[PDB]
Amino acid sequence: AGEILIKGGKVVNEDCSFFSDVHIRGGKIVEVGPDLRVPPGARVIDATDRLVIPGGIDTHTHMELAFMGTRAVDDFHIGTKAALAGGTTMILDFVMTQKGQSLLEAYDLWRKTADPKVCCDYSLHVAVTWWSDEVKDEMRTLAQERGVNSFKMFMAYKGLFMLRDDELYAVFSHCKEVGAIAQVHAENGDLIAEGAKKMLSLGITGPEGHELCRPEAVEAEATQRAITIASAVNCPLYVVHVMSKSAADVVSKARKDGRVVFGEPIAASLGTDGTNYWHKDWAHAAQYVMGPPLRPDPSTPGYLMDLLANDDLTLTGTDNCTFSRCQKALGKDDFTRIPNGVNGVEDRMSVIWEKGVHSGKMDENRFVAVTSSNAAKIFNFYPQKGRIAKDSDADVVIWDPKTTRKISAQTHHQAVDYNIFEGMECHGVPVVTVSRGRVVYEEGRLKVSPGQGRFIHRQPFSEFVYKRIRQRDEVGKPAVVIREP
């Protein structure tokens, strides 16, 4: 039957925690309540002294992405296995359409690659890296028929993915027309371009040049510029990988001011900092290189966790885009050629629990919100996921909040041969992972088949995202002053 009864644990949802068993049948949670009967044949997972939580949803992955001419080593198969071993049961990955390339073709190419490989459920965002009538039509089709309500735009990567303010305005207007959320990579691409060209001319070729060429003012600027353009068209906006206190503060201010904007710090920016770029060992330093960079102010990850706790920032991904040591080494003489990207998919849940909950910054319920529920709300499949409740999908993690585990490339399940959280002792261990109603990780071991996970098709106009937008369309229309002719 695939029947499971999770007994003896404490259920933790975004709103409150309560003791109850959870009955899973055929991919679904079919009952939640105290002292449930064990149906004959059902497997019991004993969750005594464990929390029973929705599996983590990683909003931000790049599994096997061909990026700076090379291709990330964690692929859809190993990347999703690694996510499951870390208590994460869904990933949302970016279709990185090339400039001038059909968005539908790129989407089709991602689905063909991921469908036969994923070990957990997944969905997709689609990058809008150029603009034209064809792109406009394809975005409508994706939103209405292909299950995608999130488009990603770049203010960085001049020459490559970058769009100018007038194009962002049109792109954000059309996101709003098709009921999608606009995601932005917010750094000033012109400043990055000049910055790196300047660091190199000064002989600063190492990873410190990568951070110095685009300090956090560059991120904070483009963050405010994206918010202002999105506010001008009444388009909801999502700022991916918030890396710095100053860009986080921009997002915090815009929300207090009522702007429909969501900020996403990533496990990296929550669990480590950019002082690593100044490490004497070049290889160590290079491991941390990604855009935007981690910041050398050591108060940054603690500060981003505070804003995440307070909902100035709302939910988390990893930007998992991994390159091996020999791959990073492609930039040994020039930081502009180090493939950009860090790990996280596996460790996100423990890193956040240790840095956010064990530290006293947020409670276990807020932890659920910022690791699964808010992603399900924004991308439009709550309470199908992100909630332990009857009729929800059975993606469930039995969590031990008191035990610690040390993160190490020597013990992790990612394909990458290092870990930016190397050595970190985290409270918060995923002891059992359930995905689509099957036990896929227990006693330290994975049991899953590539292609077992499914693409999740979403509808447009997520209510969490759009209900205020639509009301503002109805009452916030500018009016003419009536004057004598």
Question: Residue 186 Cβ, how far from Zn ion at the closest point, in Å?
Answer: 12
Q: Which is nearer to Zn ion, 59 or 433 (CB)?
A: 59
Q: What is the DSSP string of 376-403?
A: HHHHT-TTTSS--STTSB--EEEEEEEE
Binding span for Zn ion by CB under 5 A among 171-179, 277-285, 311-319, 456-464? 311-319
Does position 319 interact with Zn ion (CB under 5 A)? The reply is yes
CA 478/CA 373 separation, integer angstroms = 35
CA 196/CA 228 separation, integer angstroms = 27
The helix or strand, by DSSP H or E, that contains position 366, with its residue range, turns out to be helix 364-368
| Residues 253-272 contacting Zn ion, CB under 5 A | none
From the list 124, 107, 109, 122, the residue with the least C-alpha distance to 77 is 122
Question: Residue 92 Cβ, how far from Zn ion at the closest point, in Å?
Answer: 11
Instruction: Decide the pairing of beta strands 237-242 and 261-265.
Output: parallel
- Tokens encoding 74: 């964690």
Q: Which is nearer to Zn ion, 184 or 305 (CB)?
A: 184
Q: Which is nearer to Zn ion, 51 or 181 (CB)?
A: 181
CA 417/CA 440 separation, integer angstroms = 23
Question: Residue 319 Cβ, how far from Zn ion at the closest point, in Å?
Answer: 4
Question: Residue 243 Cβ, how far from Zn ion at the closest point, in Å?
Answer: 11
The answer to whether 100 and 130 have CB atoms below 8 angstroms apart is: yes
Q: Which is nearer to Zn ion, 104 or 321 (CB)?
A: 321
Binding span for Zn ion by CB under 5 A among 102-110, 216-224, 312-320, 403-411? 312-320
Binding span for Zn ion by CB under 5 A among 31-39, 219-227, 314-322, 381-389? 314-322
From the list 292, 135, 277, the residue with the least C-alpha distance to 216 is 292
Q: Which is nearer to Zn ion, 75 or 319 (CB)?
A: 319
Does position 58 interact with Zn ion (CB under 5 A)? The reply is no
Please name the residue that has the structure tokens 């988390």.
316
- Tokens encoding 123: 């969905």
Helix (H, G, I), strand (E, B) or coil at 126: strand
Question: Residue 398 Cβ, how far from Zn ion at the closest point, in Å?
Answer: 30
Q: What is the DSSP letter of 455?
A: B
At 311, the amino acid letter reads: D
CA 11/CA 21 separation, integer angstroms = 8
Total binding residues toward Zn ion, as defined by CB under 5 A:
1
Q: Which is nearer to Zn ion, 152 or 458 (CB)?
A: 152
Does position 64 interact with Zn ion (CB under 5 A)? The reply is no
Binding span for Zn ion by CB under 5 A among 231-239, 250-258, 265-273, 315-323? 315-323
Q: Which is nearer to Zn ion, 379 or 466 (CB)?
A: 379
At 69, the amino acid letter reads: G
Number of residue whose CB is nearest Zn ion: 319
Q: Which is nearer to Zn ion, 12 or 155 (CB)?
A: 155
Binding span for Zn ion by CB under 5 A among 245-253, 299-307, 317-325, 408-416? 317-325
| Residues 159-198 contacting Zn ion, CB under 5 A | none
Q: Which is nearer to Zn ion, 13 or 414 (CB)?
A: 414
Binding span for Zn ion by CB under 5 A among 6-14, 211-219, 260-268, 318-326? 318-326
Binding span for Zn ion by CB under 5 A among 151-159, 192-200, 316-324, 373-381? 316-324
Question: Residue 56 Cβ, how far from Zn ion at the closest point, in Å?
Answer: 17
CA 241/CA 186 separation, integer angstroms = 9
Question: Residue 392 Cβ, how far from Zn ion at the closest point, in Å?
Answer: 28
Question: Residue 60 Cβ, how far from Zn ion at the closest point, in Å?
Answer: 6
CA 220/CA 249 separation, integer angstroms = 8
At 62, the amino acid letter reads: H
Q: Which is nearer to Zn ion, 319 or 364 (CB)?
A: 319
Question: Residue 385 Cβ, how far from Zn ion at the closest point, in Å?
Answer: 21
Spatial neighbors of 432 by CB under 8 A, at least 6 apart, are 45, 47, 397, 398, 439, 441, 442
How distant, in Å, are the alpha carbons of 4, 33, 36, 40, 230 from that of 1? 9, 21, 18, 10, 49
Question: Residue 124 Cβ, how far from Zn ion at the closest point, in Å?
Answer: 13
CA 431/CA 137 separation, integer angstroms = 46
Q: Which is nearer to Zn ion, 320 or 462 (CB)?
A: 320
CA 225/CA 35 separation, integer angstroms = 54
Question: Residue 469 Cβ, how far from Zn ion at the closest point, in Å?
Answer: 25
Report the interface residues with Zn ion, using CB under 5 A.
319
